[PDB]
Amino acid sequence: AQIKQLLQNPPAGVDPIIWEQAKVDNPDSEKLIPVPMVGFKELLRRLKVQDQMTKQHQTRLDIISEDISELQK
């Protein structure tokens, strides 16, 4: 429910009709909710997260890789 909890009632100062439409427009609602993004530094933002994200992906992939090596060895 909690999704339902935050996604409605609107965010940061984002207009309510647009915020709506991102909800309908949303390609992939469980995996995803609409999150307000704010001009360039925000994209900067996103990227910082992406990188943050990138490193952890890489690593976990390494963990699977190590376990597989152990099994094969």
Binding site: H57, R60, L61, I64, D67, L71
Partner: protein
């Protein structure tokens, strides 16, 4: 899109390790059947040099 694969990677990886473990301890034990079934083919070397 990649993260998901990562998931069924984790999956199926620790069920591979459930695998091997198992097959691992299996090999001990098939192995132990081989130390017992051996001591005692003889001590079946009594029972047969007695008959002799």
């Amino acid at each position: 899109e990649n993260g998901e694969k990562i998931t069924s990677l984790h999956r199926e990886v620790e069920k591979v390790k459930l695998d091997q473990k198992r097959l691992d301890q299996e090999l001990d034990f098939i192995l132990s059947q081989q130390k017992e079934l051996e001591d005692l083919l003889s001590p079946l070397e009594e029972l047969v040099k007695e008959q002799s």
